[PDB]
Design an enzyme around this catalytic site. Structure first.
Site, mmCIF file in Angstrom:
data_model
loop_
_atom_site.group_PDB
_atom_site.id
_atom_site.type_symbol
_atom_site.label_atom_id
_atom_site.label_comp_id
_atom_site.label_asym_id
_atom_site.label_seq_id
_atom_site.Cartn_x
_atom_site.Cartn_y
_atom_site.Cartn_z
ATOM 1 N N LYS A 1 7.167 2.282 12.533
ATOM 2 C CA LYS A 1 7.761 3.229 13.414
ATOM 3 C C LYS A 1 7.580 2.032 14.855
ATOM 4 C CE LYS A 1 2.748 4.344 13.730
ATOM 5 N NZ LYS A 1 2.331 3.724 13.204
ATOM 6 N N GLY B 1 -3.038 5.975 5.101
ATOM 7 C CA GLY B 1 -3.361 5.481 3.725
ATOM 8 C C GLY B 1 -1.927 5.824 2.674
ATOM 9 N N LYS C 1 4.582 4.950 18.605
ATOM 10 C CA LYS C 1 4.906 6.460 17.872
ATOM 11 C C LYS C 1 5.221 7.293 18.482
ATOM 12 N N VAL D 1 5.283 8.762 11.253
ATOM 13 C CA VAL D 1 4.476 9.158 13.700
ATOM 14 C C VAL D 1 2.984 10.234 11.533
ATOM 15 C CG1 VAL D 1 3.515 10.958 15.183
ATOM 16 C CG2 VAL D 1 5.893 9.468 14.549
ATOM 17 N N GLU E 1 -2.764 -1.273 11.017
ATOM 18 C CA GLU E 1 -1.411 -1.947 10.938
ATOM 19 C C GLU E 1 -2.473 -3.563 10.515
ATOM 20 O OE1 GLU E 1 0.584 0.048 11.364
ATOM 21 O OE2 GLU E 1 1.866 -1.131 11.466
ATOM 22 N N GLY F 1 -6.568 0.802 3.929
ATOM 23 C CA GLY F 1 -5.103 0.615 4.074
ATOM 24 C C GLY F 1 -5.291 1.071 5.655
ATOM 25 N N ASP G 1 0.287 0.738 18.518
ATOM 26 C CA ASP G 1 0.687 1.734 17.397
ATOM 27 C C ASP G 1 0.881 3.566 18.141
ATOM 28 O OD1 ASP G 1 -0.227 3.057 15.040
ATOM 29 O OD2 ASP G 1 0.792 1.451 14.701
ATOM 30 N N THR H 1 0.413 -0.779 0.087
ATOM 31 C CA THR H 1 0.500 0.204 -0.399
ATOM 32 C C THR H 1 1.015 1.692 0.224
ATOM 33 O OG1 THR H 1 -1.820 -1.434 0.803
ATOM 34 C CG2 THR H 1 -1.413 1.676 1.631
ATOM 35 N N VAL H 2 1.614 1.265 1.008
ATOM 36 C CA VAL H 2 2.794 2.309 0.951
ATOM 37 C C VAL H 2 4.042 2.406 0.471
ATOM 38 C CG1 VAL H 2 4.913 3.399 2.273
ATOM 39 C CG2 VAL H 2 2.471 2.453 3.269
HETATM 40 N N1 LIG Z 1 -0.481 1.563 6.253
HETATM 41 C C1 LIG Z 1 0.069 3.413 6.308
HETATM 42 O O1 LIG Z 1 -1.422 3.544 6.272
HETATM 43 C C2 LIG Z 1 0.917 3.742 6.930
HETATM 44 C C3 LIG Z 1 1.231 4.069 7.264
HETATM 45 C C4 LIG Z 1 1.905 5.001 7.871
HETATM 46 C C5 LIG Z 1 3.278 3.568 8.414
HETATM 47 N N2 LIG Z 1 2.392 2.267 7.606
HETATM 48 C C6 LIG Z 1 4.072 1.875 7.549
HETATM 49 O O2 LIG Z 1 4.230 0.844 6.368
HETATM 50 C C7 LIG Z 1 4.701 -0.038 6.320
HETATM 51 C C8 LIG Z 1 4.372 -1.037 5.231
HETATM 52 O O3 LIG Z 1 2.638 -1.149 5.548
HETATM 53 P P1 LIG Z 1 1.970 -0.739 4.507
HETATM 54 O O4 LIG Z 1 0.401 -0.537 4.351
HETATM 55 O O5 LIG Z 1 2.746 -0.418 2.949
HETATM 56 O O6 LIG Z 1 1.831 -2.780 4.291
HETATM 57 P P2 LIG Z 1 0.944 -3.832 3.059
HETATM 58 O O7 LIG Z 1 0.447 -3.029 1.628
HETATM 59 O O8 LIG Z 1 1.436 -5.016 3.560
HETATM 60 O O9 LIG Z 1 2.620 -3.346 2.459
HETATM 61 C C9 LIG Z 1 3.847 -4.553 3.035
HETATM 62 C C10 LIG Z 1 5.166 -4.568 2.108
HETATM 63 O O10 LIG Z 1 5.514 -5.108 2.184
HETATM 64 C C11 LIG Z 1 6.155 -6.661 1.581
HETATM 65 N N3 LIG Z 1 6.137 -7.394 2.845
HETATM 66 C C12 LIG Z 1 5.588 -7.833 3.794
HETATM 67 N N4 LIG Z 1 6.879 -8.475 4.868
HETATM 68 C C13 LIG Z 1 7.647 -8.769 3.763
HETATM 69 C C14 LIG Z 1 9.212 -10.222 4.430
HETATM 70 N N5 LIG Z 1 9.222 -10.411 5.857
HETATM 71 N N6 LIG Z 1 9.822 -9.887 3.116
HETATM 72 C C15 LIG Z 1 9.741 -9.051 1.911
HETATM 73 N N7 LIG Z 1 8.811 -8.493 1.683
HETATM 74 C C16 LIG Z 1 7.484 -8.289 2.570
HETATM 75 C C17 LIG Z 1 4.990 -7.572 1.108
HETATM 76 O O11 LIG Z 1 5.205 -7.848 0.514
HETATM 77 P P3 LIG Z 1 4.054 -8.397 -0.715
HETATM 78 O O12 LIG Z 1 3.041 -7.372 -1.292
HETATM 79 O O13 LIG Z 1 4.980 -9.733 -2.303
HETATM 80 O O14 LIG Z 1 2.763 -9.055 0.172
HETATM 81 C C18 LIG Z 1 4.441 -5.575 0.772
HETATM 82 O O15 LIG Z 1 4.957 -5.743 -0.898
HETATM 83 C C19 LIG Z 1 4.180 -0.675 7.710
HETATM 84 O O16 LIG Z 1 5.792 -0.313 8.461
HETATM 85 C C20 LIG Z 1 2.925 0.181 8.190
HETATM 86 O O17 LIG Z 1 3.480 0.287 9.565
HETATM 87 C C21 LIG Z 1 1.646 2.445 6.544
HETATM 88 N N1 LIG Z 2 -2.483 1.891 11.510
HETATM 89 C C1 LIG Z 2 -1.558 2.841 11.508
HETATM 90 C C2 LIG Z 2 -1.169 3.547 10.278
HETATM 91 C C3 LIG Z 2 0.003 4.872 10.558
HETATM 92 O O1 LIG Z 2 0.877 5.025 11.613
HETATM 93 C C4 LIG Z 2 -2.648 4.231 12.266
HETATM 94 O O2 LIG Z 2 -4.134 3.646 12.213
HETATM 95 O O3 LIG Z 2 -2.618 5.292 12.416
HETATM 96 NA NA NA Z 3 4.445 12.577 9.763
#
Ligand SMILES: NC(=O)c1ccc[n+]([C@@H]2O[C@H](COP(=O)([O-])OP(=O)(O)OC[C@H]3O[C@@H](n4cnc5c(N)ncnc54)[C@H](OP(=O)(O)O)[C@@H]3O)[C@@H](O)[C@H]2O)c1
Ligand SMILES: N[C@@H](CCO)C(=O)O
Ligand code: NA
Ligand SMILES: NC(=O)c1ccc[n+]([C@@H]2O[C@H](COP(=O)([O-])OP(=O)(O)OC[C@H]3O[C@@H](n4cnc5c(N)ncnc54)[C@H](OP(=O)(O)O)[C@@H]3O)[C@@H](O)[C@H]2O)c1
Ligand SMILES: NC(=O)c1ccc[n+]([C@@H]2O[C@H](COP(=O)([O-])OP(=O)(O)OC[C@H]3O[C@@H](n4cnc5c(N)ncnc54)[C@H](OP(=O)(O)O)[C@@H]3O)[C@@H](O)[C@H]2O)c1
Ligand SMILES: NC(=O)c1ccc[n+]([C@@H]2O[C@H](COP(=O)([O-])OP(=O)(O)OC[C@H]3O[C@@H](n4cnc5c(N)ncnc54)[C@H](OP(=O)(O)O)[C@@H]3O)[C@@H](O)[C@H]2O)c1
Ligand SMILES: N[C@@H](CCO)C(=O)O
Ligand SMILES: N[C@@H](CCO)C(=O)O
Ligand SMILES: N[C@@H](CCO)C(=O)O
Ligand code: NA
Ligand code: NA
Ligand code: NA
Lengths: 331, 331, 331, 331
Positions: free
Chosen positions: B99, B290, B195, B124, B180, B177, B191, B13-14
């Site tokens: 985080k 997001g 932060k 954060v 966590e 999206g 979470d 997603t990110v």
């Molecule tokens: N979503 C948000 O709103 C948001 C906001 C801020 C921070 N974050 C942080 O961004 C980070 C990623 O979140 P996300 O929303 O992008 O999660 P996501 O959609 O699950 O994406 C995770 C990505 O990393 C890959 N992956 C997961 N574990 C792995 C491993 N052990 N080895 C190799 N590849 C791996 C997945 O591969 P596949 O696609 O092949 O499954 C995917 O491409 C998290 O740390 C989350 O806390 C998210």
């Molecule tokens: N799951 C987290 C991602 C962003 O830090 C949230 O809901 O705020």
């Molecule tokens: Na920020």
């Protein structure tokens, strides 16, 4: 012959395996007196690729009170909890593969467990017999229990002995479907801790608190550590232990140095090892994670229910520990 | 003009949002004399449909040591750690949105943070300015900080206020999206605790331990409790608080009863509210989760790096609080 | 430098290839003076597996009047038509790969074609030059045109010569992505008829009616027929023909017996063959179907627009036929 | 008890629903002394998530000659034809939901229909009784037939009445699994024409040609035209009509202005309305599209077959109409 109306919560790897298993075995079910009919399957994306017919999917919660059974494999704690509780309150049984739910919402769920409404074989080592194993072990009194309850971390350690790195093995593990949604639960011992808690409540203390489990995962382990262990004639494994100390049950998860010929060390899948009085030493092993493996467990529970048996009852009262365990070498 | 060589860990997603944002802003990057070149993108499943070129996908770890930047958005702690440390040791910066990693692997990561090598605005409140906001607030001495840091639980409490259920809301936020991968991390306050830890470390104590944050979640709240708060002229929110108590800094996450006109109660988005000496009372709010929102933060950090600025520095010392404080009343 | 705001209709094999191509070539676009920014991508399932970031997807129609360009590759006729017309009315150009739309809604779309608002290279033989080919051929007067305009039926016939059955080859064709949503359009000649119509309007008669094309598909063809043709030194192919008869343009699609050394017979992909006065014999061939191939065509049209050139204009007036064609052996 | 050996062609919206319906009704089938055994399931893409066992998926055609029944729900005409003919020639029945196939390949299929080998209730109005309804209406002489046979366009006109757009409605019906793969077939009246043809052949003329149906669609209709009809006390619907004109049977599909109290105007679902001598005026309505709805029809036909009844017979002769008729006023 009767209709068995089933509400399924979750349509993922498990949910979908369970759905197809039920229909594939409807001839068996007819010999049990029933024809299976799904009311609906709760998911998040009702239009994506999924191994269940689209019209059964529900992207929103639906009323469960007309079901004869609720089957849950959605993951998490508070969302399944709130979904299942009105069904439980109405005397509708629950079959779950969700160890987090039962470990972390036990104040709410114990009373329904105690009236035999909760079936959860699939919540520890999937459809490997673990809970039924312990149910038969109650003929004896536990002296010590040691399991390799988490399949992800077993896979990872198996791969790192072979010289593969943590990250490639975890990656490899997550492709093969073994890990939880967040693999942190696996690799920090928490998922083993949830499983160990459930074992404790069945066998030794129906109030055993999840918070009392000491848990340490595999984050300090490397291929080198593991290969050096091999050279001393040992294997390192993540082990979940239950043993008496100072007159109380203690529960720990941690990496341990095992003799390489120990049943726990030579198990290729997940494993539960006990010593109990007067039985002696007993051991069960099988697949601990995966769709088909978990659906087997849930289906074993459905047949159990259809047979007129209750769900997995907690120990009727806490049992006094007979010996001071505290075996151990950590790593 | 020179290649900016990027290793990206995660394509989800990110990661995907980030990848495509970088591509479409290539014009902007040319104004620094760079062109962005991805060395590879670490992913689990190279077969899923992805807005990233197949030829750049890696399903096993790849050498990072030729990168000018590692961007991480994979999730988890130990695996990202073991993957970035070699780059960090080589003096390659890390830009992360994770985080949990920073909160839970700080013994390993703090030395590189102290050298300016870790950029984590997106860790954060996503690309809403939080870390940069606090960097400016360093011109004063902190009196107290209170934030609504978790987007998933804000979203849930906003939808429950309007009469929706917990379960419905949760399903949505996962869909959007926000959550966590283990949404328990969101709804039990963990979470927000992660932060909070990072904000404590930036402002007041560069070794502030994650284990010292007291956290409780939204698991006792219902549409009813929230609607009754509204009738008392209040809003219940999950609040992350940093405040002085008996000469030490206390960090807590809990539901709080807020006056309805409070900035925290009204905010559009996640929000951070800080009283400091001599500035006074300042506030920032925006989207806290997001893909797009997060990719904005990561890209902000990449531009920061290209400007010659260091990453986010821990507080250069620990210091006690100026004033005894407290949070709002619990629920 | 300016923003080029794009509304994309469809996010399938083509839509998604186009989206990623645009971003991947943003450096090229900057040399044309623009930075590409997608307003939204219209799809049906906004949460399933797709090679575009989820937040760009729109599962409902959205306002197109703020776009600088509309790109369509959604398929069908009346739904894209109603979506594009307000954009066209506002003077916003359309780039489409949709031959059905243009062939069957020409009463509505001709006037916008005539003011140079419609770009549609990708609607005949994908990003193989066909329309630009004919635009240069207008220097001459057509004597006869024969094309193998449908890639599905070419694939199928190629496979049946090799002794594979219709059904296995069509199946094989649909896996490889060549067929329309309903392959009946392909195998009955109708998709060739739509393409042939568009060629006719460019070159010989801007009012040419789709209903005037005689079309017969490949339903009577078998491996035996094709292999017997091979033995007579011929190849059977589905051919789209335009030729004068009794002072009017005639358009047909049908299977034809070709000499095996004819350019049309020896083409491995799609092909357009003309004889024109005074140029002589000319021929273009390339891939006629597929994601990457079609996205090339749409991107070629975007660059054309950015260059200040109009879209594909119909013939300014119908052209008098010079000779009685009517070549032919059917099958 | 004996295997009922089924070859299934198609594993999609209909095929999958059918497969799983058969499985769950295995108890019911045992009451005929059969157990259902699938010999294989023809599909395009054996990799998509599907509620059918991987081991039964075939991506190439498989021998049908051991089946007791071929069930077809793949779509198209020529490919299903070439696949079923050998089974039909062997005296193996076909159960199909494919109205295009029967309408457009009748020269090949009529002889086997006349022998009782083709069951196709699900080819018109899905599992709503239409063919069986007409079979009963054969006790009388037809005066006139008018139906709303196409679910996708009923759905669209119902949603446009309520102010929704064409494009929105269409997107939905495709989502709901109603639309032909080419939705142009639905909205231009062709799919209703195919259905109409089959009703003509069952009732009045066993060689009634599909080419003789006059068809026009809903492409000129808007929320405005429909809302203005409502204010005149009418509903506009797409109607398939069979009526006598100058001593011959005329078949037309077109939008019609209906009095709002007419059964056709009010119906819940698709609908068929028939005046016949001496019965009078009869009507049937129900869902005319959907996986479940279609799988019901197919399963009804399988039970019909197991009862020893033949398939749906064409009219045993052609006969002229009794009375001169007409449809309602066009739009
Ligand atoms: N979503 C948000 O709103 C948001 C906001 C801020 C921070 N974050 C942080 O961004 C980070 C990623 O979140 P996300 O929303 O992008 O999660 P996501 O959609 O699950 O994406 C995770 C990505 O990393 C890959 N992956 C997961 N574990 C792995 C491993 N052990 N080895 C190799 N590849 C791996 C997945 O591969 P596949 O696609 O092949 O499954 C995917 O491409 C998290 O740390 C989350 O806390 C998210
Ligand atoms: N799951 C987290 C991602 C962003 O830090 C949230 O809901 O705020
Ligand atoms: Na920020
Ligand atoms: N797989 C194993 O090996 C294994 C073994 C033993 C036990 N378990 C247990 O089985 C459970 C599920 O695992 P799994 O592997 O099947 O997970 P999985 O493949 O992700 O599927 C989980 C399912 O639950 C749905 N879902 C999740 N959260 C939801 C919410 N808040 N609201 C509505 N729907 C929700 C998902 O919807 P979508 O599909 O739309 O996203 C999906 O259908 C977990 O408790 C796990 O611990 C798993
Ligand atoms: N592929 C080729 O080789 C090729 C070559 C030349 C020209 N073309 C032309 O390109 C067009 C599309 O082809 P494709 O291969 O990309 O098709 P595809 O893979 O099915 O994708 C079509 C896209 O349009 C969306 N869609 C379809 N009907 C819709 C509606 N009524 N409302 C909203 N969204 C709708 C789909 O949504 P979902 O994805 O949610 O279902 C999908 O995103 C056709 O006109 C075709 O003739 C294709
Ligand atoms: N949907 C309805 O409401 C409805 C109602 C009544 C009748 N019908 C009829 O049912 C039939 C099937 O419709 P549907 O909704 O099930 O379509 P669908 O969802 O597209 O299913 C088509 C199935 O046939 C397979 N397939 C398509 N063309 C093929 C080929 N040339 N060779 C081998 N396999 C092929 C597909 O494989 P993949 O899944 O691998 O793609 C899929 O399993 C149509 O004739 C339709 O007119 C549908
Ligand atoms: N992720 C868990 C599932 C069941 O314990 C495991 O690896 O074992
Ligand atoms: N299905 C079409 C796409 C473009 O003509 C083909 O096979 O050629
Ligand atoms: N597309 C068809 C399927 C059922 O005949 C309909 O809409 O009625
Ligand atoms: Na088990
Ligand atoms: Na072209
Ligand atoms: Na029917």
């Amino acid at each position: 012959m009767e209709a068995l109306k089933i509400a399924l919560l979750g349509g993922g790897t498990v949910g979908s395996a369970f759905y197809n298993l039920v229909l594939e075995r409807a001839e068996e079910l007819s010999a049990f007196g029933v024809v299976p009919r799904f009311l609906g399957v709760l998911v998040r994306d009702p239009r994506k690729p999924r191994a269940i017919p689209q019209e059964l999917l529900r992207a929103e919660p639906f009323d469960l009170l007309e079901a004869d059974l609720v089957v849950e494999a959605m993951g998490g704690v508070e969302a399944p909890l709130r979904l299942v509780l009105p069904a439980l309150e109405a005397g509708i049984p629950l079959i779950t593969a969700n160890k987090a739910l039962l470990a972390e919402a036990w104040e709410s769920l114990r009373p329904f467990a105690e009236e035999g409404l909760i079936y959860h074989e699939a919540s520890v080592m999937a459809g490997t017999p673990a809970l039924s194993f312990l149910e038969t072990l109650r003929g004896s009194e536990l002296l010590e229990l040691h399991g390799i309850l988490n399949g992800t971390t077993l896979y990872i350690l198996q791969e790192m002995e072979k010289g593969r790195t943590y990250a490639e093995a975890l990656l490899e593990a997550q492709r093969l479907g073994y890990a939880e949604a967040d693999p942190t639960l696996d690799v920090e011992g928490i998922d083993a801790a949830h499983k160990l808690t459930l074992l404790a409540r069945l066998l030794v203390d129906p109030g055993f608190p999840f918070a009392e489990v000491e848990a340490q995962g595999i984050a300090r382990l490397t291929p080198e550590v593991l290969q050096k262990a091999e050279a001393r004639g040992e294997r390192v494994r993540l082990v979940a232990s239950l043993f008496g100390e100072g007159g109380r049950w203690r529960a720990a998860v941690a990496p341990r140095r095992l003799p390489q010929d120990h049943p726990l060390a030579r198990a290729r899948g997940n494993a539960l090892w006990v010593r109990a009085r007067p039985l002696g030493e007993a051991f069960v092993t099988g697949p601990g994670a995966g769709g088909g493996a978990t659906a087997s467990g849930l289906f074993a529970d459905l047949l159990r229910f259809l047979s007129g048996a209750p769900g997995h009852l907690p120990a009727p009262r806490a049992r006094p520990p007979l010996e001071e365990g505290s075996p151990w070498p950590g790593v």
